[PDB]
């Protein structure tokens, strides 16, 4: 209904964007709210310079380091820039089969 009612807003204010467009805009806004909230969650981890936190993200949808085209790639921004190297080198609980594909 936020998408529908916002579409009503844009329709009556004269802006021409279809309802699915407003759905997409609302989805992106919510996903950015999710990114901010998860950034807050990870910020709970480290508060003092001596803090050591083992963050376990058990969601399957958190983008893998190798999956740069993953749908929720923006969630990779949750990890602070400084700790992105350990994000790249991170232990995967349930990874997805890779191979040695000769066409490398």
């Amino acid at each position: 209904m936020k998408a529908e009612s916002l579409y009503g807003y844009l329709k009556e204010r004269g802006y021409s964007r279809t309802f699915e467009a407003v759905n997409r805009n609302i989805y992106l806004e919510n996903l950015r709210k999710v990114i901010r909230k998860a950034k807050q969650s990870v910020g709970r981890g480290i508060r003092s310079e001596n803090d050591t936190v083992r963050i376990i993200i058990l969601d399957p949808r958190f983008p893998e380091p190798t999956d740069l085209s993953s749908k929720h790639r923006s969630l990779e921004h949750i990890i602070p820039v400084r700790f992105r190297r350990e994000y790249r080198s991170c232990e995967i609980l349930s990874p997805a089969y890779f191979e040695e594909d000769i066409q490398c």
Binding site: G14, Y15, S16, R17, T18, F19, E20, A21, L28
Partner: protein
């Protein structure tokens, strides 16, 4: 001299489609995809660049106006120089190859040839592609069937005189029998394409020419129709477009910019907003777009973008924002020393 990056979104008002020979195949009309069918389509930056070059050419034509005789001052040579940068009469300044910043006189006198280059003079406008933001923002739009008008509306038969009603009857008969004949020939053709897969190369020297002679027989049968060369009851193939209300990320840039060139570009955008159409299939109103471009420039020396304004093209109007963009437009409107002829 400022590099103006128009970073912005194109929201699609009616489906945005483009026909590119490589993308389109026998399997159907598909958008340029940069990979397999599962890849993400992109609207070419070439189509947008050509559309905006046409818009700028029209702006130049209007600003120049018409002669006392009511004919555009541009001849075919000048028209093709401004429109597609091809010198037809071989009379153009063949700038030496190794000076990058060559043609400053032509760039000053001709801002259209400055923004969009000619052959041998690098253009200043790099118009990037409209990349979709989402995952399901394309679709097989169009599609349908060219229905025989008189088999849908019977009332239209009351207008046909009997000497034309029998002509219609003959046309339908010929269409039907020619179409079952072409169907049989196509069935033989696809059976042969199945047989190609068991190729031993003894038959293949004959099979492809056999296929070609079957296509020739198809063309002969189509020619045999006395009353209508092409079947009217055609199922229209769908064309792949970007969905209505698709948010496509668009990056356009002008390189180092005299106020006049940037003003001409902004005027071209203002004239394109009259008919904001990208791509073809204009019969289905395809291509109608509204786009908000944040005009950023680079700080002198520093590597940081400063936002000079916004170009919001919408059906309700063009909202040029920022005093500097207005200054560029005013500079282009003034400085009437431009000599687009040759």
């Amino acid at each position: 001299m400022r590099t103006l990056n128009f970073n912005g979104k194109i929201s699609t008002l009616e489906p945005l489609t483009v026909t590119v020979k490589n993308a389109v195949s026998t399997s159907g009309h598909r958008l340029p995809r940069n990979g397999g069918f599962n890849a993400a389509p992109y609207f070419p930056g070439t189509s947008i660049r050509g559309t905006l070059r046409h818009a700028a050419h029209k702006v130049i034509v209007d600003r120049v106006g018409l002669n006392a005789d009511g004919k555009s001052p541009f001849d075919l040579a000048e028209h093709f120089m401004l429109a597609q940068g091809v010198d037809i009469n071989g009379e153009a300044e063949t700038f030496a190859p190794g000076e990058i910043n060559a043609g400053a006189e032509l760039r000053s006198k001709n801002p259209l040839i400055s923004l969009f280059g000619r052959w041998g003079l690098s253009g200043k406008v790099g118009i990037g592609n409209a990349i979709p933001d989402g995952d399901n923002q394309w679709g097989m739009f169009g599609g349908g069937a060219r229905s025989i008008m008189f088999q849908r509306d019977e009332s239209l038969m009351e207008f046909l005189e009997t000497d034309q009603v029998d002509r219609l009857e003959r046309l339908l008969e010929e269409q039907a029998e020619a179409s079952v004949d072409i169907s049989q020939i196509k069935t033989e053709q696809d059976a042969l394409k199945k047989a190609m897969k068991s190729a031993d190369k003894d038959t293949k020297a004959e099979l492809q020419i056999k296929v070609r002679e079957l296509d020739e027989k198809i063309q002969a049968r189509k020619d045999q129709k006395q009353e209508s060369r092409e079947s009217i009851r055609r199922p229209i193939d769908p064309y792949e477009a970007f969905i209505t209300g698709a948010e496509l990320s668009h990056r356009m840039s002008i390189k180092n910019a005299t106020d006049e060139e940037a003003g001409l570009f902004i005027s071209a955008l203002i004239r394109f907003a009259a008919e904001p159409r990208f791509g073809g299939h204009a019969n289905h109103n395809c291509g109608l777009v509204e786009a908000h471009w944040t005009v950023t420039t680079w700080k002198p020396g520093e590597l940081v973008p400063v936002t000079l304004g916004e170009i919001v093209i919408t059906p309700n109007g063009v909202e040029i924002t920022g005093d500097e963009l207005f200054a560029m437009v005013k500079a282009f409107n003034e400085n009437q020393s431009f000599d687009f002829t040759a």
